[PDB]
Each structure stands twice: as structure tokens, then as C-alpha cells.
Design a protein around this motif. Sequence first.
Motif, PDB file in Angstrom:
ATOM      1  N   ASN A  22       0.826  -1.190   0.000  1.00 45.05           N
ATOM      2  CA  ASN A  22       0.000   0.000   0.000  1.00 45.05           C
ATOM      3  C   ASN A  22       0.868   1.250   0.000  1.00 45.05           C
ATOM      4  OD1 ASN A  22      -1.163   2.146   2.199  1.00 45.05           O
ATOM      5  ND2 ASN A  22      -2.707   1.543   0.703  1.00 45.05           N
ATOM      6  N   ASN A  23       0.636   2.119  -0.973  1.00 41.14           N
ATOM      7  CA  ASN A  23       1.441   3.327  -1.141  1.00 41.14           C
ATOM      8  C   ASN A  23       1.003   4.443  -0.195  1.00 41.14           C
ATOM      9  OD1 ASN A  23       3.207   2.986  -3.871  1.00 41.14           O
ATOM     10  ND2 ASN A  23       1.245   1.941  -4.121  1.00 41.14           N
ATOM     11  N   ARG A  24      -0.027   4.189   0.605  1.00 39.60           N
ATOM     12  CA  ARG A  24      -0.526   5.204   1.523  1.00 39.60           C
ATOM     13  C   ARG A  24       0.295   5.209   2.813  1.00 39.60           C
ATOM     14  NH1 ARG A  24      -6.470   2.903   0.620  1.00 39.60           N
ATOM     15  NH2 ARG A  24      -5.947   1.896   2.614  1.00 39.60           N
ATOM     16  N   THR A  25       0.609   4.028   3.332  1.00 45.49           N
ATOM     17  CA  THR A  25       1.399   3.931   4.555  1.00 45.49           C
ATOM     18  C   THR A  25       2.704   3.167   4.332  1.00 45.49           C
ATOM     19  OG1 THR A  25       0.099   1.985   5.268  1.00 45.49           O
ATOM     20  CG2 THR A  25      -0.550   4.139   6.147  1.00 45.49           C
ATOM     21  N   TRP A  26       2.977   2.800   3.075  1.00 44.03           N
ATOM     22  CA  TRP A  26       4.187   2.041   2.724  1.00 44.03           C
ATOM     23  C   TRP A  26       4.152   0.653   3.362  1.00 44.03           C
ATOM     24  CZ3 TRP A  26       9.471   4.778   1.885  1.00 44.03           C
ATOM     25  CH2 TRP A  26       9.289   5.886   1.048  1.00 44.03           C
ATOM     26  N   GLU A  27       2.948   0.132   3.547  1.00 45.63           N
ATOM     27  CA  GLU A  27       2.749  -1.131   4.241  1.00 45.63           C
ATOM     28  C   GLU A  27       2.798  -2.298   3.267  1.00 45.63           C
ATOM     29  OE1 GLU A  27       2.038  -2.049   7.914  1.00 45.63           O
ATOM     30  OE2 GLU A  27       3.093  -3.417   6.560  1.00 45.63           O
TER      31      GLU A  27
END
Length: 37
Positions: A22-27
Motif C-alpha cells: 500500500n502506497n498510503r502507509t508504505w505497508e
Amino acid sequence: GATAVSEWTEYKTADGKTYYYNNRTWESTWEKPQELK
């Protein structure tokens, strides 16, 4: 943040394990995102 959906990209390991990045939290989790479920 979100690119308006598709912020979760699938990455597979040679042995065939799919972890979703996920590019939102780098998860990078083996859990399946609700935006991709």
C-alpha cells in the motif's frame, strides 16, 4: 495518499506468495485490502 483506488499493488515471491503493498502507509501485508477484496 490514495491515487483514488489501486493504491494497493500486488507483489509475488518466486514461490508464489502475494503480499500487497500500500502506497498510503508504505505497508506490505499478506492481508487482502478492502479496496481490492
